[PDB]
């Protein structure tokens, strides 16, 4: 029974917590309450293989911290989340990508690029093409999500990260 530490990272307000709570509790949280650090555990069967998921929902910090060093070191896989309505959050994907690899001292590491809030079509500023161009640059999977009901790709996103970790 393996444990996967899945770490959800990204700029403030991109929907890290909403995605995590949608995954665990199947509810959309409309409030924006900034996270310090929250941990969610589940014993679950994915692709006929039981696992413990230890999901770490992180703070929306841009600057580096000891907290971030700790979770970048221990994480077994990362969701790098941006909001399609927030261009800066997308630009900053490179910073997260760079730091994870530097902390791990590796050329690659399990991660998925998550383009969140795609339900907000009238506010969307980062296109699917832009997202795919970024994911292709890093040779990592790209997925579009929405935490709002009805949710889009939320289970798939977390399960796909587990699949990437297992398919190493
Ligand atoms: N329409 C829509 N709103 C979303 C979506 N995901 C999150 N939100 C909203 O965006 C706001 C910020 O979400 P939140 O989950 O707190 O983001 P966060 O990345 O965890 N923030 P922090 O970095 O401060 O902890 C909330 O008002 C939340 O309801 C989404 O997919 N669609
Ligand atoms: Mg949060």
UniProtKB/Swiss-Prot annotation:
What does the entry comment about cofactor binding?
Answer: Binds 1 magnesium ion per subunit.
Q: Where in the cell is it found?
A: Cell membrane
Q: Name one GO molecular function term.
A: GTP binding
- Where the record places motif Effector region is 32-40
Write the Enzyme Commission number(s) for this entry.
Answer: 3.6.5.2
Binding residue positions for Mg(2+): 17, 35, 57
Q: Name one GO cellular component term.
A: plasma membrane
Q: Which cofactor(s) does the record list?
A: Mg(2+)
Reaction catalysis annotation: GTP + H2O = GDP + phosphate + H(+)
| Main localisation | membrane
| Residues annotated to bind GTP | 11-18, 28-30, 32, 34-35, 60, 116-117, 119, 146-148
- Top-rank taxon of the source lineage equals Eukaryota
The alphabetized UniProt keywords are: Cell membrane, GTP-binding, Hydrolase, Lipoprotein, Membrane, Methylation, Nucleotide-binding, Prenylation
Instruction: Provide one Gene Ontology biological process annotation.
Output: Ras protein signal transduction
Q: How does it sit in the membrane?
A: Lipid-anchor
Question: In UniProt terms, what function does this protein have?
Answer: Signal transducer in the Ras-MAPK signaling pathway that regulates cell proliferation and survival. Core component of the SHOC2-MRAS-PP1c (SMP) holophosphatase complex that regulates the MAPK pathway activation. The formation of the SMP complex only occurs when MRAS is GTP-bound. MRAS has low intrinsic GTPase activity and may require additional factors for activation. The SMP complex specifically dephosphorylates the inhibitory phosphorylation at 'Ser-259' of RAF1 kinase, 'Ser-365' of BRAF kinase and 'Ser-214' of ARAF kinase, stimulating their kinase activities.
Record text on subunit structure and interactions: Component of the SHOC2-MRAS-PP1c (SMP) holophosphatase complex consisting of SHOC2, GTP-bound M-Ras/MRAS and the catalytic subunit of protein phosphatase 1 (either PPP1CA, PPP1CB or PPP1CC). Interacts (active GTP-bound form) with both SHOC2 and PP1c (all isoforms) to form a tertiary complex; SHOC2 and PP1c preferably bind M-Ras/MRAS, but they also bind K-Ras/KRAS, N-Ras/NRAS and H-Ras/HRAS. Interacts with RGL3. Interacts (active GTP-bound form preferentially) with RGS14.
| Family, as annotated | Belongs to the small GTPase superfamily. Ras family.
Q: Report what the protein is called.
A: Ras-related protein M-Ras
**Portion of the full sequence shown:** 11 to 178 of 208
